[PDB]
Write a protein that binds this ligand. Structure first.
Ligand SMILES: Nc1ncnc2c1ncn2[C@@H]1O[C@H](COP(=O)(O)OP(=O)(O)O)[C@@H](O)[C@H]1O
Ligand SMILES: Nc1ncnc2c1ncn2[C@@H]1O[C@H](COP(=O)(O)OP(=O)(O)O)[C@@H](O)[C@H]1O
Ligand SMILES: Nc1ncnc2c1ncn2[C@@H]1O[C@H](COP(=O)(O)OP(=O)(O)O)[C@@H](O)[C@H]1O
Ligand SMILES: [Mg+2]
Ligand SMILES: [Mg+2]
Ligand SMILES: [Mg+2]
Ligand SMILES: [Mg+2]
Lengths: 525, 526, 211, 538, 106, 49
């Protein structure tokens, strides 16, 4: 080895060794992630070094939680991480397609064929596949039913049946709640809270906010019916002067005067709040809730509670925007210009206590543009799994709304796309037809893995589905209960079009780049 | 006891003679052999592992050479010349390494034949002068106004990279970025793509969606949610001074003895912030950009005037914004002027890409800085795309500064080798043999291209030499993908003259430097 | 991990697809190394022992024995090739290549959920058909000197240099024809192979006697 | 031919200390075995005849108790599946307060029978579906098994009878006395408003006189002494201050600037006069007891002694808030004299000695108030801790009764009836789910079996007799622990009853834990780390 | 027992159950009571205990003697605890309590 | 992402101390270099001088 003659402490793989190493790593990753695909996939238990337990079947989460130190695994993991970051779904399919592409490419490379021809065939097949996907997408008006179908198609793969149905209802309702016509959807306005006191099916959607902190003064009211919401970012605690003031007195009376007069600055803002509260509501019928992003010292808390005002302190920064959109007021950084129109309105505010932590509920808003999903479960791992599932569902629904087209699932699109690629193969000049065939066979992995996870046999189910598609022309997928060919569109198994496009692009690019690597070096020491 | 007495300290090794020369030449040859196979349109990529856990999948020679560690000092010299070639012209980093390795390889033959290295060095210098002369003689002019030819040049520069699939888009991006970055002031032409052509990579999406913006794009969000995230024609005001209340430089201390002094001082802090914001507002801006923090009270006073503020932007990003929107960064807003207000930005949008907020100052009219937004499969893919785009922009700048072109695909190598060989017939001294040796050592580029293509080296190279023995055949090279001899007037693969000149100069001078060396000494401290 | 590892803590066990993958990988590695041996256009190999003895060879069996391998499947394949060499004296490289390719082709279908038993049944049927076809295609012919020369050439050209092979062909055919009784088994123990170290490799010949 | 290499793929890619377990035999059976081991370890403490266990944690702290949740807390459980079952048990403890041993036993039985079903040929999905169907059937049946209701909570004898069963499992020898104590303490709490707060019941443990000498006090007891010289007040008018009993100081910076000799001579005298005026102003309102959360200045103590004011210092602010709730006072942020609304009243405050420790008692004479305290005597700290755990179980049972007033028969009667009904239901369901349903029904036998085993009799005879009597039509007949031979008796008359919510939540959580354990197919354990605990748990 | 690839409790956990465990508890209580047997009555004797620092303590009081002993047996610590309880509540009888408890168990 | 594993097949099955060189660069050029070194070592003793 030339490299080892310079740096003796180096690890090098060259020529066929690099391809063998990369393909072996990809095949191992695919072998591990085969069991995740589909609603019939198997759960995994992931125990960290500290002993924490996770129960997930996500491709990205599983990839993060394996104990793997391989370079090709790192590359595939980064590709899947980008997949999850942008589209939010299709990581297991990403890994499976990359692995099958590499396997099919090696099936020809091992017989003396240069990888460049395979990459050219991959490029041609990718172009044709993108054209076919454009031809096959189903443009639709994203009503509630289609969104529910998409949410089921994701959550059934992420959790079990009835929990999936509950999560579908909650996710679709929340997305439709925060969605503005002809305006991009901001997923930051859906706050995800976790409480750990009830069953997993108790997860629901609250048309308001749930804050993990409550009023710190015992005398403050625990339940306010009609509330005026004041969202502020003003410090109501003692603040030191920036220029190192210090006090100088000559008697105890002077010290008492200086003690009493050092609170005047904060007392002025507290008095402004109290004056606004008195002006807005002259009786005890209505309530006043002050939600502050900064701290409130006990003196200000007592002064506010003497007037029947509920005050929250150290609220999250995003809660300013969330309460502004839900309650409808305005976030204030100063009280100099305080007006009644600056107050949001909430139809119910109450505090819920669970163990050592207290939660505040702000419900019955007029038309909340920001809502919250309250994840409930008896275990921490259940809460984490439900959070991941609802993230996947929210991404899926947002993607479906973003473009009015959705793609049939259950492997139908891959089968039809492979058939189209096979038909188009003769048009490709040269030996790139081998690469086109490899790409089609790699695309056919999804129905194969679905049949495996459902417990059927790959060959019989695949030939049945392919024969049905060729004979009828419909987009027929895999029936995970009977194994027979089945139309995905009619039953309501939908896949995100953007997810499939990203899958094709990323898988083709990463496979082409890996296949062209002929040397692996570790000589930075 | 009685420790031994030495002249030089312990562990001070010394090697001398023919062994040192052979070791240096073999080290250079090994360094060349490391990246020999990464040349041409048929090059295969390499997968490097960083000591910190990173992975560098690249085809660029300079990146590969800078990501490895060596102990032989000749290898260090080779790495240094690769870095020099990368920094000077932008590409040619593996061609120069291969050429230097071949020159040292052919110099070893004379060093083993009782020839002093000084004679070889003199012959090499004469040969380098004649190569410069021939390269300038066989060049062709280019008019920079023709955008099609510029795109073709950039394409011929990037056909050897992983971006050749989207070569057209890449060429358009590089050309537009270089054209916008180009700037002149006080009679000083300036093309500074290092600072004013920023490449931002966001993983995801598709690479076909990557584009160059008529503005800038920074990973920032509004300080306050009430602030507008969409403004049509913003009047941008740039700052590099914090909008908060800060302690003075002097040792200042207060002494409070009256009741109302504490609250008074706090009120003066608030009033100072208010006056600062009023001074900013007097110019009637739309967005305010600061390099330092912005206090919450300042945010309130700015939103009172319907002004969007971005809190903490980097120095380089602020400079790019100043170039793009025509603003001028100021520190004391009481000294703010109308000329410092940045008008020219055609839109300001703050939209969420993935799970992050990004600020767009796009749609500028005549911007002098740009952001290349790259979207792709992952971080390694985007890093390689960024390196290829850097090569493309460097080549575009080299062509813009120096508008001559020379044929590629080894045609220039063969033409210069033939001219050098023909001129060598006039010499009668002993220096002619190393002269011809380096002349034919220049033939390594077409040989490497043929080897990488997978064709037969001996007969193809012999036929190419025979073709170049004719009169009007100096533009005849080799196809890098089909392994056949073609006229580069038809293939269209041309290279900037500056790149070739720098490559030849660096190769010959590295050969000279490593030939001058003997008596290696090592082990001493600092 | 498994039952065996539970009973014996320091036990190495590969189960289900792991064992099949291990065996197929070993066979593929052996095939990959021995591919270059096949045919007269193959490549010489230099084998250096621990003591420093140099041995140039192209034989598959000789290469396998001086291989530095500690794999079980490699041991099994080496024993099969050893038996092939012991009985017939030829075909060791072809043996290893065919075994490796059979395993690779079987894995090509096994990796898609097919049970190996069906593959083995197909192998048995194909072996029966191939034996029938080999019986059909064999060329029965009375062996004069020319045909024996052709066979000896077909072996020695693949073993050694072409001119050395041409010399060895005449040597071996003449020796075999000399020691051969009519319609009786040939005793190769009656051909003494004596080696001397003072001339060129093409000086080897046949002595109609004993040395 | 002497070593087995790691299989190419995931096996070679795995880290050094990592472990990977996949498939039925390698993962599911191992998890079931671990859960069965945990259930067996906790099993012997079930029921009234359960045996205490000496558990010593990593800090050499001795726990002796038969509370399953405490035992699992103090055990260093390492297996992830056992960790999951322990989490389910702790969730049951948090939601209800009793039934943790039931959760553990039911989960263990369910997982053992799940292993049996998988061995005979059923699939994991079929077992999970059958278990869920049977759990739904059990939850439907359970309301029909209610035998009697609480029907009163302001009574003393009736609530004591209700709470006797919950604290008969622990402290089997003497449960009537503890039931009476907890009943009195809870009846003092729980006003006309239906809300009942568990925190309002305080337990102060004083060593020396045996648990039979324990009593309930309407007020609070603090184990410390008074700062002043007054040690007894008969008509306390406590004023509570959350500020230190000292002259208030500037928060910025204090510096006495003296420029003349007169100021230097007069500063201390003026400060003393000011503090005397403040203390006299406090005393003029009638406050004969002062409670502070901070330090007490020497001059403050002197002037409080001069005006005959009892001083009590409470370092913990939780105790300060509880005292404010008890007396009906408000914590003044400053040292201003309290107005008539903020001055709490207690009918007696005095310094007393119980056993060895000195205590301060805020004693009410009425049988009411916001906070009530149970003072526990005993000869050992561990015994008092166990009695405190029993008191917590009784209080949680009272809270559950306030939430839902329905009750079900105990001693395995409800479990046997549920098993019979679920078996009858599964006898009609066709398909492979019938095996899982029948096994779920059979898993209920682990409760009467464990009760009989702990009691020291033959479990099989008890279970057969229980089935015979239940088939006859007696749904309130269960195990009789007051016999040396297997016998059963009607347990509605015996008064041994269980809360409906306890059984409902225990069944739900146990089934959820079992199905969640069954759902796992692969385990990828990372290399163990010796970190100084996760930062979340501190 | 079996290796159990993933063990239930942390490695090194010691468990003892059944009749032998309770008999050993009784024996430990007997051992503790033996340490104060000769301190009872007018003919009682004093005990000298030296700590790690070398300071010796001489006492006829049962509670003090039990406190000085660094008892670590969980069942034996109950005797020390009841001696402390008797000293706290009453102040006399700190030896009779331990003797009576150990005699009951015996 | 910090170590390069051995390629499956012959590379993994090779013994501990064994060395394998294949191809032109790894084998033929190295052998030629070694023979050149030997010839250079003995060269200076050639001839009467
Ligand atoms: N009910 C269903 N019937 C048939 N096929 C389904 C059903 N639900 C999902 N699928 C298919 O199974 C696949 C599920 O993959 P999934 O586990 O979500 O991987 P990822 O999370 O990486 O997208 C989808 O491609 C979808 O087409
Ligand atoms: N289409 C082509 N046909 C033949 N040769 C080409 C072609 N494109 C580029 N080349 C040759 O490849 C070389 C560029 O290879 P590259 O990897 O960029 O090396 P460097 O980094 O030294 O520029 C140039 O010398 C050029 O002559
Ligand atoms: N006197 C009794 N006779 C028979 N069984 C009883 C009696 N008292 C309680 N039980 C039974 O003991 C069980 C309580 O066990 P316990 O140790 O409290 O476990 P957990 O704390 O998990 O409920 C109840 O199910 C009840 O049926
Ligand atoms: Mg998915
Ligand atoms: Mg280049
Ligand atoms: Mg042969
Ligand atoms: Mg209980």
């Amino acid at each position: 080895a030339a490299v080892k003659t310079l740096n003796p402490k180096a690890e090098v793989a060259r020529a066929q060794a690099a391809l063998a190493v990369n393909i072996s790593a990809a095949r191992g990753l695919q072998d591990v992630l085969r069991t995740n695909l589909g609603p019939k996939g198997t759960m995994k238990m992931l125990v960290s070094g500290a002993g924490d337990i996770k129960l997930t079947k996500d491709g990205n989460v599983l990839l993060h939680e394996m104990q793997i130190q391989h370079p090709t695994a790192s590359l595939i993991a980064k590709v899947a991480t980008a997949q999850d970051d942008i589209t939010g779904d299709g990581t297991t399919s990403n890994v499976l397609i990359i692995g099958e592409l590499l396997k099919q490419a090696d099936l020809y490379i091992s017989e003396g064929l240069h990888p460049r021809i395979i990459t050219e065939g991959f490029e041609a097949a990718k172009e044709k596949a993108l054209q076919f996907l454009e031809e096959v997408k189903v443009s639709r008006e994203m009503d509630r039913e289609t969104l529910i179908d998409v949410a089921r198609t994701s959550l059934r793969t992420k959790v079990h049946a009835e929990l999936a149905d509950v999560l579908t209802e909650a996710v679709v309702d929340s997305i439709l709640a925060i969605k503005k016509q002809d305006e991009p959807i901001d997923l930051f306005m859906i706050e995800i809270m976790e409480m750990k006191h009830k069953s997993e099916t108790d997860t629901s959607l609250i048309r308001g906010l749930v804050l993990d902190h409550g009023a710190r003064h015992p005398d403050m009211k625990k339940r306010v019916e009609d509330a005026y919401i004041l969202t502020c970012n003003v410090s109501l605690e003692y603040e030191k002067t920036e220029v190192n003031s210090g006090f100088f007195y000559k008697s105890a009376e002077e010290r008492e005067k200086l003690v009493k007069a050092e609170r005047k600055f904060i007392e002025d803002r507290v008095k402004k709040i109290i004056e606004l509260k008195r002006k807005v509501c002259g009786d005890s019928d209505k309530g006043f809730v002050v939600i502050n992003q900064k701290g409130i010292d006990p003196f200000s808390l007592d002064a506010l509670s003497k007037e029947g005002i509920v005050a929250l302190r150290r609220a999250k920064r995003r809660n300013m925007e969330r309460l502004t959109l839900a309650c409808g007021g305005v976030a204030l950084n100063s009280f100099d210009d305080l007006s009644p129109d600056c107050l949001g309105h909430a139809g119910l505010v109450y505090e819920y206590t669970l163990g050592e932590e207290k939660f505040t509920f702000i419900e019955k808003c007029n038309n909340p543009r920001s809502v919250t999903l309250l994840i409930k479960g008896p275990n921490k791992h259940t809460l984490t799994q439900i959070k991941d599932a609802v993230r996947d569902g929210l991404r899926a629904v947002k993607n479906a709304i973003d473009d009015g087209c959705v793609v049939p699932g259950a492997g139908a699109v891959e089968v039809a796309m492979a058939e189209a690629l096979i038909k188009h193969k003769p048009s490709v000049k040269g030996r790139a037809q081998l690469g086109v065939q490899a790409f089609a066979d790699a695309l056919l992995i999804i129905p194969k893995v679905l049949a495996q996870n459902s417990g059927f046999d790959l060959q019989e189910t695949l030939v049945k589905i392919q024969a049905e598609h060729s004979e009828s022309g419909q987009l027929v997928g895999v029936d995970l209960n009977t194994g027979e060919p089945m139309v995905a569109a009619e039953v309501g198994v939908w896949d995100n079009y953007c997810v499939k496009k990203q899958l094709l692009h990323s898988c083709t690019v990463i496979a082409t780049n890996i296949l062209l690597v002929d040397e692996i070096m570790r000589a930075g020491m | 006891g009685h420790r031994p007495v030495l002249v030089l300290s312990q562990n001070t090794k010394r090697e001398s003679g023919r062994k040192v020369q052979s070791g240096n030449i073999n080290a250079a040859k090994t360094i060349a052999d490391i990246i020999r196979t990464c040349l041409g349109p048929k090059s295969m990529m390499k997968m490097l592992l960083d000591p910190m856990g990173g992975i560098v999948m690249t085809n660029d020679g300079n990146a590969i050479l800078r990501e490895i560690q060596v102990q032989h000092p000749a290898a260090k010299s080779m790495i240094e010349i690769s870095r020099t070639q990368d920094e000077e012209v932008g590409d040619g980093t593996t061609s120069v390494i291969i050429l230097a390795g071949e020159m040292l390889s052919v110099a070893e033959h004379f060093l083993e034949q009782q020839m002093h290295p000084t004679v070889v060095i003199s012959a090499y210098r004469k040969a380098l002068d004649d190569m410069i002369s021939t390269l300038k003689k066989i060049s062709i002019p280019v008019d920079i106004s023709d955008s099609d030819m510029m795109l073709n040049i950039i394409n011929s520069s990037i056909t050897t990279k992983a971006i050749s699939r989207w070569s057209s888009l890449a060429c358009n991006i590089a050309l537009d970025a270089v054209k916008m970055v180009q700037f002149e002031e006080n009679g000083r032409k300036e093309i500074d793509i290092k600072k004013y052509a920023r490449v931002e990579k966001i993983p995801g999406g598709i690479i076909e969606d990557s584009c160059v913006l008529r503005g800038v794009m920074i990973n920032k969000d509004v300080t306050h949610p009430r602030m507008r995230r969409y403004i049509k024609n913003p009047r941008i005001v740039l700052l590099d001074s914090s909008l908060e209340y800060k302690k003075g430089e002097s040792q200042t201390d207060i002494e409070i003895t009256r009741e109302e002094d504490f609250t008074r001082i706090l009120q003066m802090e608030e009033e100072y912030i208010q006056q600062l914001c009023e001074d900013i507002i007097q110019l009637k801006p739309d967005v305010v950009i600061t390099e330092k923090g912005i206090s919450d009270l300042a945010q309130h006073y700015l939103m009172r005037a319907n002004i969007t503020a971005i809190r903490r932007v980097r120095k380089t990003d602020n400079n790019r914004i100043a170039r793009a929107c025509g603003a001028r960064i100021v520190s004391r807003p009481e000294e703010l002027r109308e000329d410092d207000v940045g008008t020219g930005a055609g839109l300001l949008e703050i939209k969420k890409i993935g799970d992050e907020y990004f600020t767009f100052i796009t749609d500028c009219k005549d911007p002098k800085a740009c952001t290349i937004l790259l979207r792709g499969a992952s971080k390694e893919i985007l890093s390689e795309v960024e390196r290829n785009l850097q090569d493309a922009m460097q080549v575009c700048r080299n062509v813009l500064l120096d508008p001559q072109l020379v044929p590629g695909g080894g045609a220039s190598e063969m033409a210069v080798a033939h001219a050098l060989t023909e001129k060598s017939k006039a010499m009668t001294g002993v220096e002619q043999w190393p002269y011809r040796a380096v002349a034919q050592a220049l033939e390594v580029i077409p040989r490497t291209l043929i080897q990488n293509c997978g064709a037969s080296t001996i007969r193809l190279l012999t036929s190419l030499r025979a073709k170049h023995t004719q009169e009007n055949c100096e533009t005849w090279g080799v196809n890098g993908e089909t392994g056949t001899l073609v006229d580069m007037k038809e293939l269209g693969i041309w290279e900037p003259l500056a790149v070739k000149l720098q490559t030849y100069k660096t190769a010959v001078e590295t050969a000279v430097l490593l030939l001058r060396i003997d008596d290696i000494v090592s082990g001493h401290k600092k | 991990m498994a039952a065996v590892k539970t009973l014996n803590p320091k036990a190495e066990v590969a189960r289900a697809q792991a064992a099949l993958a291990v065996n197929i990988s070993a066979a593929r590695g052996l095939q990959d190394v021995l591919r270059t041996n096949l045919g007269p256009k193959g490549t010489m190999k230099m084998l250096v022992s621990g003591a420093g003895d140099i041995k140039l060879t192209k034989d598959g069996n000789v290469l396998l024995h001086e291989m530095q391998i500690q794999h079980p499947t490699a041991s099994l394949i080496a024993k099969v090739a050893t038996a092939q060499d012991d009985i017939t004296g030829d075909g060791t490289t072809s043996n290893v290549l065919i075994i490796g390719e059979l395993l690779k082709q079987a894995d090509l279908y096994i990796s898609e959920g097919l049970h190996p038993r069906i593959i083995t049944e197909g192998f048995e049927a194909a072996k029966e058909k191939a034996l029938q076809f080999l019986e059909e295609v064999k060329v029965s012919r009375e062996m004069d000197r020319e045909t024996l020369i052709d066979v000896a050439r077909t072996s020695l050209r693949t073993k050694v240099h072409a001119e050395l092979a041409d010399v060895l062909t005449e040597a071996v055919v003449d020796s075999i024809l000399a020691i051969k009784k009519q319609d009786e088994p040939i005793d190769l123990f009656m051909i003494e192979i004596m080696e001397m170290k003072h001339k060129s490799e093409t000086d080897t010949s046949l002595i109609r006697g004993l040395v | 031919a002497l070593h087995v290499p790691k299989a190419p793929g995931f096996a070679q890619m795995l880290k050094e200390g990592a472990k990977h377990f996949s498939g039925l035999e390698e993962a599911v059976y191992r998890n079931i075995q671990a859960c069965k081991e945990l259930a067996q370890t906790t099993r012997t403490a079930y029921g009234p005849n359960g045996m205490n266990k000496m558990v010593i944690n990593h800090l050499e702290k001795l726990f002796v108790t038969n509370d399953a949740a405490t035992i699992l807390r103090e055990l260093e459980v390492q297996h992830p599946a056992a960790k999951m079952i322990v989490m389910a048990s702790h969730m049951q403890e948090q939601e209800v307060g009793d039934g943790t041993n039931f959760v553990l036993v039911f989960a263990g039985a369910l997982l053992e029978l799940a292993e049996e079903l998988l061995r005979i040929g059923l699939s994991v999905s079929e077992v999970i579906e059958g278990y869920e169907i049977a759990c739904r059937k059990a939850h439907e049946i359970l309301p029909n098994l209610v035998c009697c209701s609480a029907k009163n909570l302001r009574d003393i004898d009736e609530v004591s009878s209700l709470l006797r069963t919950s604290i008969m499992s622990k402290q089997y020898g003497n449960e009537v006395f503890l039931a009476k104590l907890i009943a009195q303490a809870c009846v003092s709490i729980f006003p006309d408003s239906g809300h009942f707060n568990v925190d309002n019941i305080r337990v102060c443990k004083i060593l020396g006189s045996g648990i039979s000498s324990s009593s309930v006090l309407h007020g609070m007891v603090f184990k410390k002494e008074t700062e002043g010289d007054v040690t007894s007040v008969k008509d306390a008018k406590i004023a509570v201050y959350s500020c230190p009993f000292d002259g208030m100081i500037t928060e910025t910076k204090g510096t006495v600037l003296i420029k003349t000799a007169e100021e230097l001579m007069n500063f201390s005298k003026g400060e003393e006069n000011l503090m005397d005026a403040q203390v006299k102003a406090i005393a003029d309102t009638g406050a004969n007891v002062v409670v502070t959360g901070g330090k007490v200045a020497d001059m403050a103590l002197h002037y409080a002694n001069k005006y005959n004011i009892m001083l009590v210092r409470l370092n913990s602010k939780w105790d300060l808030r509880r005292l404010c709730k008890t007396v009906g006072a408000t914590a003044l942020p400053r040292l201003t004299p309290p107005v008539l609304e903020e001055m709490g009243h207690c009918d007696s405050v005095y310094l007393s000695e119980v056993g060895d420790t000195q205590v301060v008692v805020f004693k009410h004479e009425k049988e009411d108030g916001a906070i009530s305290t149970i003072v526990l005597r005993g000869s050992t700290d561990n015994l008092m801790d166990d009695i405190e755990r029993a008191v917590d179980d009784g209080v949680n049972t009272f809270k559950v009764l306030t939430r839902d007033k329905r009750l079900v028969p105990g001693g395995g009667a409800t479990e046997i009836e549920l098993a019979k009904q679920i078996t009858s239901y599964g006898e009609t369901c066709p398909g492979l789910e019938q095996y899982a349903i029948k096994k779920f029904a059979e898993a209920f036998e682990a409760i009467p079996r464990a009760l009989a085993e702990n009691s020291g009799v033959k479990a099989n005879e008890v279970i057969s007799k229980l089935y015979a009597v239940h088939q006859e039509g007696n749904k309130n007949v269960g195990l009789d622990i007051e016999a040396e031979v297997p016998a059963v008796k009607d347990m509605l008359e015996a008064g041994i009853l269980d809360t409906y919510l306890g059984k409902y939540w225990a069944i739900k959580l146990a089934t959820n834990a079992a199905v969640t354990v069954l759902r796992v197919d692969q385990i990828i354990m990372a290399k163990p780390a010796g970190g100084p605990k996760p930062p979340s748990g501190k | 027992m079996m290796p159990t690839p993933v063990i239930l409790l942390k490695e090194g956990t010691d468990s003892s159950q059944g009749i032998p465990q309770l008999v050993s508890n009784i024996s430990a209580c007997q051992v503790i009571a033996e340490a104060v047997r000769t301190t009872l009555g007018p003919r009682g004797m004093d005990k000298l205990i030296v700590d790690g620092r070398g300071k010796a303590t001489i006492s006829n009081d049962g509670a003090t003697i039990l406190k000085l002993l660094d008892v670590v047996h969980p069942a034996a610590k109950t005797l020390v605890d009841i001696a402390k309880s008797q000293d706290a509540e009453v102040g006399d009888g700190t030896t009779s309590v331990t003797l009576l408890a150990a005699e009951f168990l015996k």
